[PDB]
Design a protein around this ligand. Structure first.
Ligand SMILES: CCCCCCCCCCCCC/C=C/[C@@H](O)[C@@H](N)COP(=O)(O)O
Length: 446
């Protein structure tokens, strides 16, 4: 029959788990300045944490997908929850003379994180058409809320407690509880995946050969490159914006220097507020623009993406010169650029599913993702830190020069955003032809 409360309890528990996952992910970028001051490292060391975390997630995701494909799922999910909760809790006890060890800790988290985002969504697909679409929408909309909460709790715990260590100790406790219910309240153990009807295999393919066709898809390649550029920009900005804002506030002499008060606390909370509102706002505006423009021409999605990218690049270029005088203009530019940047999220997946044939579709959702991390946020924070260090090395160490060097280094992101917009325009050039070829192939194969 139909399980009464299980299909709702599982969805709610997994949504809470995803929120906690992203909160754990961003709680270390929330308080980066305190880590920098305590461990005595420069910008390169600051970016190394996020770079290592993203690299570990990159490596770990396909292996955990493979493991969850055939082995048990709920035990793997609970083990991952417990593992990164324990690692995060233990990472707060490291002294100030073993900074490298802390970096290693992030890598371990980067493993456990990959055990969730690759396995948690598919369980939803087991349990639910319209209901499945609504659940999946809620599950994916849990992301910006999680990032915002990560920022707010990090900053607020740093302010109230007076020590950044606590910011890494209250997050995983909720994990220790959460996984427990995932082990006792998730209905069933493993269902579905019974596509091998008749015998033990019906359609195994060969992975590589179909991949050989994927390079021949110009629209798919260009869209993947544009997604990689977007990931680069988002990772760099999300890692480095709060520190930039704090330095801009300290050079202008609004508040005192760090460690006399609880340093920068309102900026991170405010930034969490904008990102929390902006995830939803950007998704809504992108969907509405696509819906309106679909009835006027067949190239609505990539042209809309390109226009949004150009606008986001313009506003991201504007904020850097606007932040010198006042901060309200900087926040307004953050808002506008945030919406214009995240307007493309759903449209990217829509065009991906709309171009490539269903049979290879799953493979694309893997490969692109890997590329979306390979040229994106794998080394973007490290690159920004390295450029900032190189600029500051040939100049005297002053707060104003620190802020100016960070701004000049961050100026790289709008160039990449413009490149992504150009790539989306290239996608729009060939989208119709690729769609026609895919339609002909899928119709004539039957
Ligand atoms: C201007 C300030 C910007 C600061 C924003 C940082 C806040 C982070 C919120 C978003 C959290 C990560 C979003 C994930 C993006 C990638 O996974 C997708 N674009 C790639 O997957 P695919 O495209 O294939 O679906």
């Amino acid at each position: 029959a139909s399980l009464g409360r299980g299909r709702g309890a599982a969805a709610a528990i997994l949504s809470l788990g995803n929120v906690l996952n992203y909160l754990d992910r961003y709680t270390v970028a929330g308080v980066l300045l305190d880590i920098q001051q305590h461990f005595g490292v420069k910008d390169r060391g600051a970016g190394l944490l996020q770079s290592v975390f993203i690299c570990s997630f990159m490596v770990a995701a396909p292996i955990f997908g493979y493991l969850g494909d055939r082995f048990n799922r709920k035990v793997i999910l609970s083990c991952g929850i417990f593992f990164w909760s324990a690692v995060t809790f233990s990472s707060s006890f490291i002294p100030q003379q073993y900074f490298w060890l802390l970096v290693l800790s992030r890598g371990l988290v980067g493993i456990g994180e990959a055990s969730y985002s690759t396995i948690a969504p598919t369980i939803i697909g087991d349990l639910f058409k319209n209901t499945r679409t609504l659940m999946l929408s809620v599950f994916y909309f849990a992301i910006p809320l999680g990032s915002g909460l990560g920022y707010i709790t990090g900053s607020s715990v740093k302010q109230a407690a007076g020590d950044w260590h606590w910011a890494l100790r209250v997050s995983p406790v909720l994990g220790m509880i959460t996984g427990t219910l995932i082990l006792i309240l998730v209905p069933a153990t493993k269902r579905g995946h019974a596509d091998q009807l008749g015998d033990q295999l019906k359609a195994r393919t060969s992975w590589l050969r179909d991949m050989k066709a994927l390079i021949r898809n110009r629209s798919y390649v260009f869209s993947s490159l544009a997604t990689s550029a977007v990931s680069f920009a988002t990772g760099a900005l999300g890692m480095w914006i709060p520190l930039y804002l704090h330095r801009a506030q300290v050079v202008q002499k609004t508040a005192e220097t760090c460690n006399s008060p609880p340093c920068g606390a309102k900026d991170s909370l405010i930034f969490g507020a904008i990102t929390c509102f902006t995830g939803f706002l950007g998704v809504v505006t992108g969907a509405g623009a696509t819906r309106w423009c679909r009835l006027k021409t067949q190239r609505a999605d990539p042209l809309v993406c390109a226009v949004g990218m150009l606008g986001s690049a313009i506003f991201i270029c504007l904020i850097f010169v606007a932040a010198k005088s006042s901060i309200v203009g900087a926040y307004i530019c953050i808002f506008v650029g945030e919406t214009l940047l995240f307007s493309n999220w759903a449209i990217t997946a829509d065009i991906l599913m709309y171009v490539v044939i269903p049979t290879r579709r799953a493979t694309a959702v893997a490969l692109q993702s890997f590329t979306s991390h390979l040229l994106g946020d794998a080394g973007s924070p490290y690159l920004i830190g390295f450029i900032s260090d190189l600029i500051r090395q040939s100049t005297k160490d002053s707060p104003l020069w620190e802020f100016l060097s960070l701004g000049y280094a961050l100026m790289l992101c709008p160039f990449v955003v413009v490149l992504g917009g150009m790539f989306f325009l290239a996608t729009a050039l060939f989208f119709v032809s690729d769609r026609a070829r895919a339609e002909q192939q899928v119709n004539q194969l039957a």
